Ligand binder design. Structure first.
Ligand SMILES: CCc1nc(N)nc(N)c1-c1ccc2c(c1)N(CCNC(C)=O)C(=O)C(C)(C)S2
Ligand SMILES: *[C@@H]1O[C@H](CO)[C@@H](O)[C@H](O)[C@H]1NC(C)=O
Length: 333
């Protein structure tokens, strides 16, 4: 099953799922970086403007609902949400699984007032699941309907014409329609986290990063590519970029000439070009352009580490293999 994803500024990719009976529609992201499923709850106080600007799941409207009510909190790098648990059927691209999801009731304006989507569908292992709530892709594998215990992602480039698909997530395989060449898999440095071994990050002619190795989290739930303040500060100095509050910028007219950044993975350089990582809004020297690379200090047990978000996935189609604890990579198409 494949699920079309909408592209919002190269910073937000989400598809559609259906919770309840009758189905109550929800825009959600498929986050390989988390492990729970949550959606804005109808029980959320409208003092959280975020809930006023999003879709709310009501249980008094689903006959296929099963109350639980345990409270949980999902802490993300860029923001936190909170609420209680509930169970009900969920429809994801043709498949139907009964799931335990988070009915969020505390959803902060900043950042969620900037969420084009409503909730999140964790694609990570149950090992990271908060509340030990069985993840969904696990629930789907319990059906033995998928041809392969793998799911892939395809993030497109923010096109300006409503006709191109923002992206696509296939459950059970890897659509050939969007990658050329063949996949190059790397094994997970451990099962329970979609993280792998990275053998250096190079910026042109100088592997002035991740020498002696480092960790790499393949996060479809992250907008950009991140490292640790140390790593980034050093990378960001090698470009002539300036630090702001939440990102870096380089006089726009110098973006087409920034250098390549290659991420050594599994024994194959994955290279990115200025065009790949810079939001080239303008070509002037009197304006500033943002880099699709940020600093994020991911806390253990996963951190410190680099995060390979949508900036990196836009160039390389990703396959997530649950059956072999390995992540595949192919050039985007
Ligand atoms: C998709 C959930 C998610 N998963 C992980 N692993 N990390 C995150 N930082 C987020 C997470 C949380 C909140 C926001 C956010 C991402 N993003 C980035 C969206 N990322 C993608 C891949 O679509 C936003 O833009 C805000 C609305 C500010 S709020
Ligand atoms: C919620 O689900 C968990 C998962 O097994 C279960 O143990 C618990 O009893 C449920 N909560 C309640 C109060 O029903």
């Amino acid at each position: 099953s494949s699920v079309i994803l909408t592209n919002y500024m190269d910073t937000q990719y989400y598809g559609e799922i259906g919770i309840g009976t009758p189905p109550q529609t929800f825009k959600v992201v498929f986050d390989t970086g988390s492990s729970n499923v949550w959606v804005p709850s109808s029980k959320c106080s409208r003092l959280y403007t975020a809930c006023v600007y999003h879709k709310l799941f009501d249980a008094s409207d689903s006959s296929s609902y099963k109350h639980n009510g345990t409270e949980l909190t999902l802490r993300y790098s860029t923001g936190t949400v909170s609420g209680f648990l509930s169970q009900d059927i969920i429809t994801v691209g043709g498949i139907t699984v009964t799931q335990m999801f988070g009915e969020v009731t505390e959803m902060p304006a900043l950042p969620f007032m900037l969420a084009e989507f409503d909730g999140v569908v964790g694609m990570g292992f149950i090992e990271q699941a908060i509340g030990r709530v069985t993840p969904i892709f696990d629930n789907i594998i319990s059906q033995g309907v998928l041809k392969e215990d793998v799911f892939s992602f395809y993030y497109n480039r923010d096109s300006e014409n409503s006709q191109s698909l923002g992206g696509q997530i296939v459950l059970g395989g890897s659509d050939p329609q969007h990658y050329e060449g063949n996949f190059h898999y790397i094994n997970l440095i451990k099962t329970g986290v979609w993280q792998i071994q990275m053998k250096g990050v190079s910026v042109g002619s100088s592997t002035l990063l991740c020498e002696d190795g480092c960790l790499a989290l393949v996060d479809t739930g992250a907008s950009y590519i991140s490292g640790s303040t140390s790593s980034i500060e050093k990378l960001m100095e090698a470009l002539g970029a300036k630090k702001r509050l939440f990102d870096y910028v380089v006089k726009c007219n110098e973006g087409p000439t920034l250098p390549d950044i290659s991420f050594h993975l599994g024994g194959k350089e994955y290279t990115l070009t200025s065009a790949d990582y810079v939001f080239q809004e303008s070509y002037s020297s009197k304006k500033l352009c943002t880099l699709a690379i940020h600093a994020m200090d991911i806390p253990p047990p996963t951190g410190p580490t680099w995060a390979l978000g949508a900036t990196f996935i836009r160039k390389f189609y990703t396959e997530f293999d649950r059956r072999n604890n390995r992540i595949g990579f192919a050039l985007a198409r």
